[PDB]
Design a protein around this ligand. Structure first.
Ligand SMILES: Nc1ncnc2c1ncn2[C@@H]1O[C@H](COP(=O)(O)OP(=O)(O)OP(=O)(O)O)[C@@H](O)[C@H]1O
Ligand SMILES: [Mg+2]
Length: 358
């Protein structure tokens, strides 16, 4: 990807790149990841910014978002486990989620990331430059991850450097829609773009820099689907990337999976992955791809209709259903992506470990 983007002129004038750290399995059990200097998780940067009372309430308060959300799931479903999400997709409409979800979001400190930056920078150049750098990098990674369908983008999978504002993606345990496909609680966003990101740009919403870069990137890729498509097809056809390797990762997710039941092993459909990748690179609607992945993964679930109704949206508030299912341009695709990733109806139904409120 960095090869392509180095060769796209409109991106090269923006010096755009992902960072990679070299990775070396020496054995099927064992390997090294190269480490990175003066880096933290995004979660740690955030909670390092909360005052004692902000921090202390946020840990445990029955009205802090972590308690208030499980309580809302609990009353909107009557259960206290993974099935509470399932039942709430049947049980809560838009209004019932939006209301609690706005009340929830309100309790998150609005400035927090900005507050972090302004007190890790000398002077306003050391503010502006970092904000630009972060913003560029966050956008660039988001589009990239949608192309690869990477789904498990919670706060601990993003690292922020100190020596520059360039964000770094890690923990790629879910290639090609695997999280939206096989988890009991499906995660429906194309990438993370929650409140704090927008708030960092508060006067000057995403339709500036992020939107611009996202658009340049997607065009630069779509200039040459061939090489990237061939590489992804070689990826998805590896004999070590079957379902047996995958489900023996899915165990290792802290009870968020279907715990010790229903592997349903004729579950693996490798050509559909590269087919959906080619559809994305051809100009397909992101909501249609999400609905297709939902149909492939959860077809017999009692909330499949509600799943696709939430993922597709309504023609009244979200512009991803007011567009065709294919032939979209790069700008329309990025608009649909930003509408789906910031949809409150989708964020109000997300798994609690993803932390959609922050
Ligand atoms: N390449 C890296 N360079 C520097 N620090 C890293 C790197 N990879 C991981 N870390 C740090 O080590 C921690 C744990 O690493 P790892 O990715 O194995 O955790 P994990 O199983 O994904 O846990 P979690 O999802 O809870 O963050 C990360 O949260 C991060 O702080
Ligand atoms: Mg992780």
């Amino acid at each position: 990807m960095n090869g392509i983007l180095a060769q796209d002129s409109a991106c090269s004038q923006r010096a755009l790149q992902l960072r990679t750290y070299s990775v070396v399995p020496m054995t099927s059990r064992l390997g090294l990841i190269e480490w990175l200097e003066n880096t933290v998780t995004l979660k740690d940067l955030l909670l390092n910014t909360m005052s004692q009372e902000e921090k202390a309430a946020y840990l445990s308060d029955p009205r802090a978002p972590p308690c208030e959300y499980k309580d809302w799931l609990t009353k909107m479903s009557g259960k206290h486990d993974v099935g509470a999400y399932m039942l709430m997709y049947k049980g809560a409409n838009r209004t019932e989620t939006v209301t609690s979800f706005r009340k929830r979001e309100s309790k998150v400190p609005a400035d927090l990331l900005k507050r972090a930056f302004v007190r890790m920078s000398t002077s306003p150049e050391a503010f502006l430059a970092l904000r630009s750098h972060f913003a560029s990098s966050h956008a660039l990674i988001c589009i990239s991850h949608w192309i690869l369908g990477i789904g498990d983008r919670h706060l601990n999978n993003f690292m922020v450097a100190m020596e520059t504002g360039g964000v770094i993606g890690i923990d790629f345990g879910h290639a090609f829609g695997s999280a939206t496909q096989f988890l009991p609680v499906p995660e429906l966003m194309p990438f993370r773009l929650t409140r704090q990101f927008i708030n960092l740009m508060l006067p000057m919403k995403e339709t500036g820099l992020m939107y611009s870069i996202m658009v340049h990137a997607l065009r630069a890729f779509r200039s040459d689907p061939g090489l990237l498509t061939n590489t992804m097809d070689v990826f998805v056809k590896e004999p070590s990337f079957d379902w047996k390797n995958f489900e023996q990762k899915m165990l290792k997710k802290g009870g968020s999976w279907i715990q010790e039941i229903n592997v349903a092993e004729k579950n693996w459909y490798p050509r559909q992955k590269i087919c959906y990748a080619k559809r994305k690179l051809a100009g397909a609607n992101p909501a249609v791809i999400t609905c297709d992945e939902l149909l492939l993964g959860h077809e017999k679930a009692p909330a499949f209709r509600d799943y696709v109704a939430v993922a597709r949206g309504s023609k009244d508030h979200n512009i991803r259903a007011q567009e065709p299912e294919s032939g979209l341009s790069e700008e329309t695709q990025v608009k649909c992506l930003m509408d789906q990733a910031t949809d409150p109806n989708i964020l109000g139904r997300t798994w609690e470990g993803w932390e959609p409120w922050m």
